[PDB]
Structure 1
Amino acid sequence: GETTDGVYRVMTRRLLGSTQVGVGVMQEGVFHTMWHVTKGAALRSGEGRLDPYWGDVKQDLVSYCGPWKLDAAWDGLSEVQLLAVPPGERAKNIQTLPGIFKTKDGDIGAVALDYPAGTSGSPILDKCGRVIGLYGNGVVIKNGSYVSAITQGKRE
């Protein structure tokens, strides 16, 4: 199927009509998404099949056709862009300065941007266009607004 680098919508026809359950990144022949989008299921790309290769429920990440390829990191200082791909809507870049999730195991960048659940897997990019993580796993804070972690995998 389509193996060109880029951002893709993850769709299902199991529910009413065609529903967008999430988003992902195709880079170096590998499709990268969040685990909660596909639950590790196989994916179709035209007549072709994409099989899961690596996944981890705790990181909430999964790669297809090969190992995780994205290894850029947020520098802790600069603005970034969420390349949001909302259901039924055109891809749109949104620029923001990340906040931080402080955990017992270290700090992680976070983006305070609100999109439908089916936008999960949309990439967060640095100024060089490198994917520093995926949007869609985070928390609901005091006033009801959503804050996503900048979730990045490890390149073996």
Structure 2
Amino acid sequence: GGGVLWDTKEYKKGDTTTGVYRIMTRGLLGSYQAGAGVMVEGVFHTLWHTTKGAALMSGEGRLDPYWGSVKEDRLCYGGPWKLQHKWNGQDEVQMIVVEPGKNVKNVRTKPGVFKTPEGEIGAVTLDFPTGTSGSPIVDKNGDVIGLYGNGVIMPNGSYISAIVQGKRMDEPI
């Protein structure tokens, strides 16, 4: 389940103002936060499981999924994956926590690693509630190095999320 380019009579493209966003939805009990994401270079990035590819409304416009991978658990709207930085495996990083029902706050942490058969992946020991996935993680220069939301629950009950990230994709050729 890795990689796929979506199929999206035009529509008005939604607001892609740079920043961190809350992904909202309406349920049988009212509106709530499904997840979060980060808008950069006119493209919306988030984990795959937050919207599962659902079209998103932003302003008076709409944003359609462009690319996504369930295995990578990443998804972007409006264009190719734009994030192009990753943890240097040395410095501390900061998560812009977009927790449902609470104001955004930054928490810094020294990443550890997930040892994969294919190498190592930065991993932050931060435990935040369902719906926080998509929250961006940044380095000291303020660049988005990855996303929060996909990891493991250790036997001690503490949650550890990998710094979910992919490489920048080129524009369609």
TM-score class normalised by the smaller sequence: over 0.9
Shift of 1:106: 0.6
Please show how residues 89-104 of structure 1 align to structure 2 within 5 Å.
89-104=102-117
Structure 1 moving runs of 4+ over 4 Å:
none
Equivalent position of 1:40 in the other structure: 53
- Normalising by structure 1, we get a TM-score of 0.97
Query: Which amino acid is the alignment partner of residue 11 of structure 1?
Result: M
- In the TM superposition, residue 18 of structure 1 has moved relative to its aligned partner by 1.0
**Number of the residue aligned with 1:126:** 139
Q: Which residue of 2 aligns with 1:49?
A: 62
Question: In structure 2, what is the equivalent of residue 153 of structure 1?
Answer: 166
Structure 1 segments unaligned to the other structure (5+ residues): none
Q: Secondary structure at 2:15's aligned position in 1?
A: coil
Distance 1:99 1:114 in 2: 14
Instruction: Measure how far apart 1:96 and its partner are.
Output: 0.4
Mapping of residues 1-156 of structure 1, within 5 Å: 1-156=14-169
Q: In 2, Cα distance between the equivalents of 1:75 and 1:57? A: 25
How much has 1:71 moved relative to structure 2? 1.2
Contact 2:146 2:163 in 1 (8 A): yes
Aligned residue identity for 2:39: M
TM-score calculated relative to the size of structure 2: 0.88
For the aligned residue pairs, the C-alpha RMSD in angstroms reads 0.8
**Bigger radius of gyration among the two:** 2
One-letter amino acid of the counterpart of residue 157, structure 2: G
Deviation at 1:153, TM superposition (A): 1.4
Shift of 1:3: 1.7
Partner Cα distance (1:58, 1:5) in 2:
27
Query: 1:14 Cα shift?
Result: 2.8
For structure 2, list consecutive stretches of 5 or more residues without a partner in the other structure: 1-13
Q: Which amino acid aligns with 2:51?
A: T
- Counterpart secondary structure, 2:131: helix
